[PDB]
Ligand binder design. Structure first.
Ligand SMILES: Cc1cc2c(cc1C)N(C[C@H](O)[C@H](O)[C@H](O)COP(=O)(O)OP(=O)(O)OC[C@H]1O[C@@H](n3cnc4c(N)ncnc43)[C@H](O)[C@@H]1O)c1[nH]c(=O)[nH]c(=O)c1N2
Ligand SMILES: CC(C)=CCC/C(C)=C/CC/C(C)=C/CC/C(C)=C/COP(=O)(O)OP(=O)(O)O
Ligand SMILES: CC(C)=CCC/C(C)=C/CC/C(C)=C/CC/C(C)=C/COP(=O)(O)OP(=O)(O)O
Ligand SMILES: CC(C)=CCC/C(C)=C/CC/C(C)=C/CC/C(C)=C/COP(=O)(O)OP(=O)(O)O
Length: 452
């Protein structure tokens, strides 16, 4: 078989892989990125396509321009199940043409020295002496099977986790996730018959009956075009999401023209803390493959880009030291936990609480102003549930005259506090990973039982 030598092999060219490629470019490294999809389809996984502007501003990723930016976003309207209470959170963001932006990032990375092979699948790892050392690839453009050696593989295969899942199962980098720690989500993009009211605002609709464990959404892509969809929690035995969509679409999108559909599709999305380690010998995992998605609102394009930024940093450091061991690449973990992972862990707890609340609970809490709509924004910043907020919330619901899980909010805050402390003390080396992990698992196990 043909054998090639690269510094870095990036597997997957979505927001995660393309960010890593972009952030590693113009540095004199020999980099190959591969994706199973043809070029003009790269980036087209079903998504609501909404990304906060802050992520581009902090990472130095290109702003979306032209046909890439479908609609400027100025905030989000959050709807109670009975739709009688709406909370507004203001903030700048973009409704993207995801494939068009994604492909432009890749083409610029390519112009900046990164080699790209589309229609190419990494079929199996090269693994020897405890190290990932590359991949066997099948290039369906050339109908060639190729062996590529790399100092580091960047695993950016999305939810498929189609490379790291083929590594020896004893390795931390092969960590799987519980079925209940992901959503299935489905969306369509449609034209609308009436102008879209406040089209610069996303709409998110909480409802445990029409989207159990997730939510419905209505994300305008223009004055007369909307991305509408829902996500529901996995591992709960729920019926087909396509059947939820058909049944309740009219509730959330009565204005759409069902004859003018531009795109439709679904996929899985992780909703948990990240991989306990995103680094091992000769490999870093990023994006959905590394469980980088915000457990509460399900947004992962922004955090995918953050994970690509951290990966590039750790890899550049590893080429300085010559150390591509787990230890040599460990800054991946330190960087990612700092930038988003600790926040995710806190929100992993909070998610579990939200998914157990009833519609009556959520209607009541929102109507009684259990929190300010402004406290929502502060909490979303680092995923913190502060004392004064929790205490006030408890006083607000103190008149409620039925059993409710809302009264567990104080204990939720306590568990969030516990897990945040653990992530603030992320293991400085691989040799501490195991005992730290068991501490985190114990916090989660104790929390689960508290809600049962
Ligand atoms: C319906 C729906 C809606 C939303 C969202 C998800 C879903 C399903 N999310 C989440 C967000 O879309 C998601 O977190 C990111 O797109 C993940 O990007 P990645 O690059 O990690 O994976 P992604 O799956 O995008 O890319 C993985 C790539 O790897 C390739 N690949 C896989 N295995 C391979 C192999 N062995 N060899 C070669 N290539 C391989 C695939 O071809 C693919 O291009 C979201 N996020 C957000 O911020 N805003 C939102 O609006 C939403 N809404
Ligand atoms: C549909 C699924 C599965 C996920 C969606 C993921 C989401 C909700 C993405 C929204 C991203 C977006 C457009 C955010 C902009 C709106 C907003 C409130 C941004 C807040 O960011 P900040 O910059 O911190 O706010 P400020 O500008 O007020 O400081
Ligand atoms: C999961 C269930 C049961 C309900 C939905 C969960 C909720 C309350 C979502 C609220 C949406 C919200 C207020 C999002 C915050 C704004 C935002 C997207 C900021 C930017 O995103 P980051 O990437 O976190 O930065
Ligand atoms: C709205 C209901 C039913 C209860 C309010 C419950 C509380 C105290 C919410 C504030 C705690 C918190 C962490 C909110 C932000 C969650 C979020 C939007 C994360 C996105 O990142």
């Amino acid at each position: 078989m043909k054998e090639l030598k690269y510094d870095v092999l990036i597997i997957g060219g979505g927001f995660a892989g393309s960010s890593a490629a972009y952030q590693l470019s113009r540095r004199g490294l020999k980099i190959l990125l591969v994706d199973s999809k043809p070029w003009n389809r790269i980036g087209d996984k079903p998504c609501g396509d909404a990304v906060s502007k802050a992520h581009f501003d902090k990472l130095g990723m290109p702003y979306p321009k032209g046909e890439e930016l479908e609609n400027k976003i100025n905030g989000i309207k959050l709807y109670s199940p009975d739709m009688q209470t709406v909370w507004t959170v203001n903030g700048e963001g973009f409704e993207l043409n995801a494939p068009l932006y994604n492909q432009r990032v890749l083409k610029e990375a390519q112009d900046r020295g990164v080699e790209i092979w589309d229609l190419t699948t990494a079929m199996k790892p090269i693994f020897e002496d405890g190290y990932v050392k590359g991949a066997v690839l099948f290039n369906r453009r050339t109908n060639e099977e190729l062996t590529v050696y790399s100092k580091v593989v960047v695993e950016a295969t999305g939810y498929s986790r189609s490379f790291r899942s083929k590594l020896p199962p004893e390795l931390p980098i092969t960590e799987d996730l519980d079925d209940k720690d992901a959503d299935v989500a489905y969306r369509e993009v449609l034209l609308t018959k009436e102008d879209i009211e406040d089209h610069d605002y996303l709409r998110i609709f909480i409802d445990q009956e029409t989207s159990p464990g997730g939510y419905w959404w209505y994300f305008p892509k223009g004055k007369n075009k909307v991305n509408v969809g829902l996500g529901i929690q996995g591992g709960m035995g729920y019926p087909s999401i396509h059947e939820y969509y058909k049944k309740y679409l009219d509730k959330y999108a009565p204005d759409v023209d069902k004859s003018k559909l531009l795109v439709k599709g679904g996929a899985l999305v992780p909703t948990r803390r990240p991989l306990y380690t995103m680094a091992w010998n000769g490999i870093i995992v990023i994006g959905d493959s590394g469980f980088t998605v915000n457990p509460v609102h399900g947004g992962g394009k922004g955090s995918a880009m953050i994970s690509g930024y951290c990966a590039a940093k750790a890899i550049l450091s590893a080429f300085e030291t010559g150390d591509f061991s787990a230890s040599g690449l460990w800054d991946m973990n330190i960087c990612y936990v700092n930038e988003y992972g600790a926040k995710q862990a806190s929100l992993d707890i909070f998610r579990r609480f939200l998914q157990k609340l009833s519609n009556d609970d959520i209607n009541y809490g929102m109507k009684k102003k259990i929190i300010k709509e402004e406290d929502l924004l502060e909490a979303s910043e680092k995923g913190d549930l502060h004392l004064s907020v929790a205490d006030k919330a408890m006083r607000v619901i103190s008149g409620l005259g039925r059993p409710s899980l809302l009264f567990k909010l104080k204990a939720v805050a306590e568990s969030m506090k516990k897990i945040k402390e653990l992530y603030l003390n992320y293991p400085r080396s691989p040799s501490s990973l195991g005992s730290w992990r068991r501490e985190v698992d114990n916090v989660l196990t104790e929390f689960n039982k508290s809600l049962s």
